[PDB]
Amino acid sequence: ERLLDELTLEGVARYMQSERCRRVICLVGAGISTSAGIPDFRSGLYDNLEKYHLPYPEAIFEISYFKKHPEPFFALAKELYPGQFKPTICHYFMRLLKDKGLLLRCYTQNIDTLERIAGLEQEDLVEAHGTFYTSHCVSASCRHEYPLSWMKEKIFSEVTPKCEDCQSLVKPDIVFFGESLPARFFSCMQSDFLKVDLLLVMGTSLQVQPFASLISKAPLSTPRLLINKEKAGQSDPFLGMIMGLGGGMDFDSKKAYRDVAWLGECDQGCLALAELLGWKKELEDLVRREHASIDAQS
Amino acid sequence: ERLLDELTLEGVARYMQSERCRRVICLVGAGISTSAGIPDFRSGLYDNLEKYHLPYPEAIFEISYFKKHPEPFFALAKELYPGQFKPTICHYFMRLLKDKGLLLRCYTQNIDTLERIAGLEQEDLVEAHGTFYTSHCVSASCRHEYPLSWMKEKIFSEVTPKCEDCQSLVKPDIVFFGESLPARFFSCMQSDFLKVDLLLVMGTSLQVQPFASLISKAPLSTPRLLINKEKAGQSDPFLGMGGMDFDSKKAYRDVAWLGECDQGCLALAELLGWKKELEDLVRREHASIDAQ
Ligand SMILES: Cc1cn(-c2ccc3c(c2)CN(c2ncc(Cc4ccc(-n5cccn5)cc4)s2)CC3)c(C)n1
Ligand SMILES: Cc1cn(-c2ccc3c(c2)CN(c2ncc(Cc4ccc(-n5cccn5)cc4)s2)CC3)c(C)n1
Ligand SMILES: [Zn+2]
Ligand SMILES: [Zn+2]
């Protein structure tokens, strides 16, 4: 017998306010930051790198190429460095989940730091594709850590960032091609996916790793709500880690029992869910107060 | 245990010609059909999907959507239907493996039928992502089978293919999102990987199931040759899901050959003494295809 009374946003809200739902995991991608003006750094932003004649377009995000020729990456980083950092209604919805004791973890494939600006703490977060929040000297014997303020000053001054201690390259803690996913992802995912009562999957197409396969690590009974412009994750039998196990999203089949798709902008979906839960005024008041503070320090 | 004398194409060829190597498994993907003009149906084909008013781009390959609205799929099938079916050097290299009693199985993730055109038979093949070669009525109680010539005529005439028995939808035997991997795959994979002496992995980045799994099903002693345009796990960690070891101090059984699958197979054919047979086979088969 399935846990949701019906496969609708209304059924998820009732489940969230039941004793059965204590621990929520959020999986978030580029779709939660587009309303904050953060480009989807995956899906034409290369068309001002003429002077660099890259050997292939993706070389700019490949660790071995970066370490030999870091200048293209830092030129692009200046061009695309966000003009302001104003988290969205969706980011503040996750802050409410934390305040209400429901947030087990926010897994993010975003690098923009908006989860932290919205008030999620390191312990609440798994930055599965890394983050601009910190940067490190690349020299194995040194690994000196630098804050974003330091990296920003290097980016805007068009000075290739070098370590103060050893003068090696300093790289933002974002995952390049040819690097591993962060240690923190592997640690947290083996424990969190045992304890999860609800997966809230927002603003991700579920095409890139780890989220494309990670959805299949949830217990088969755990309800999953996708808030996104379109249905995503119906990828079986191609992307599940276990052959013959059907862990991909199923909104549409005869056997659908636990997956709900709410189609629209992540902000409007989060407002809709907040409204059902009786949290709409709290969420709007939170966004008003936080946005007002960000504008004031402008 | 090290079955290769050396981690080179020359060491693999010597091993293949030795009594120890009787049973070769090929894992082949989109990289073996690109030189034949077959698009990689996975990896800008999302651009002209706009015109179908799909609820999400992948709906065109999803079984529940297909059964309700088959017209977009069959319209794209007309657009992307190959203009010619000329198997590659790599396809004909696997035909030589069959003829010379070395081929245990060709596992393909390709749907283009070029393995069959090259002369691999059903018994030689596991079409792990299915195939356009046959189509079936989708009604559980009917399942009338249709050949590609029948499906092609429906696709080009822009007539939704309907069963001549029951008028249900007729679907190509390709794996849509929402379907199982083929019965044939589950049967063969549990037996073949006990008997395999050599894995020949060609034109696949091992990014999706079942190849992501199959790569590690061989005995730990079984040598593995990768012939591929790009290094194993190039787009790691964003598109990859044991794993192959060409280069570490512990490397003992994995060989990489980086380049076009055709050029890799010609190189290996050279060391086997099969190059003239292979070129003559391609010439004679392509000549016959052009004549018809
Ligand atoms: C399947 C696949 C994966 N990838 C892939 C892999 C690695 C990376 C990318 C994409 C894209 N990357 C970037 N893009 C633009 C960048 C400039 C930038 C972004 C943010 C900030 N920022 C400062 C403070 C807050 N945010 C400043 C500058 S960094 C990060 C590496 C591709 C291309 N396809
Ligand atoms: C992880 C993942 C999986 N997938 C995925 C899943 C299912 C399918 C696809 C891709 C691609 N599909 C297709 N592509 C083009 C097609 C037109 C076409 C192709 C061949 C011929 N042909 C006639 C004779 C010989 N070949 C005629 C028309 S059918 C088949 C279903 C994605 C997108 N990501
Ligand atoms: Zn240093
Ligand atoms: Zn029928």
Author numbering:
A (entry chain B): 56 to 98, 102 to 356
B (entry chain A): 56 to 98, 102 to 299, 305 to 355
Paper text:
HDACs form 2 major families: Zn++-dependent HDACs and NAD+-dependent HDACs, also termed sirtuins (SIRTs). SIRT2 has deacylation activities in addition to deacetylation, including demyristoylation, and several SIRT2 inhibitors are acyl group selective, blocking deacetylation but not demyristoylation. The structures consist of 2 domains: an upper Zn++-binding domain and a lower catalytic domain with a Rossmann fold. The 2 domains behave as a clamshell, accommodating varying acyl-Lys modifications within a flexible pocket between the 2 clamshell domains.
We produced crystals of FLS-359 bound to SIRT2 that diffracted to 1.8 Å resolution and determined the structure of the complex. FLS-359 bound SIRT2 between its Zn++-binding domain and the catalytic Rossmann fold domain, in the EC pocket where other small-molecule ligands have been localized. The binding interactions of FLS-359 with SIRT2 include π-π interactions with residues F119, F190, and Y139. Water residue 566 bridges FLS-359 and SIRT2 with one hydrogen bond to the thiazole of FLS-359 and another hydrogen bond to the backbone carbonyl of residue F96. A multi-body water network in the peptide channel connects, via a hydrogen bond network, the dimethyl imidazole of FLS-359 to E116 through water residue 371 and to the side chain of R97 through water residues 371, 165, and 652. These water-mediated hydrogen bonds could be key interactions that drive binding affinity to SIRT2 in the hydrophobic EC site. NAD+ binding is not predicted to be affected by FLS-359 binding. In contrast, the FLS-359 dimethylimidazole moiety resides in the same location as the peptidic acetyl group, but computational superpositioning predicts that the pocket can accommodate both FLS-359 and the peptide. Modeling predicts that SIRT2 can accommodate both an acetyl group and FLS-359, whereas the binding of a myristoyl group excludes FLS-359. In sum, enzyme thermal denaturation and kinetics studies, as well as co-crystal structure determination, argue that FLS-359 binds selectively to SIRT2 and induces an allosteric rearrangement of the active site, reducing the rate of deacetylation.
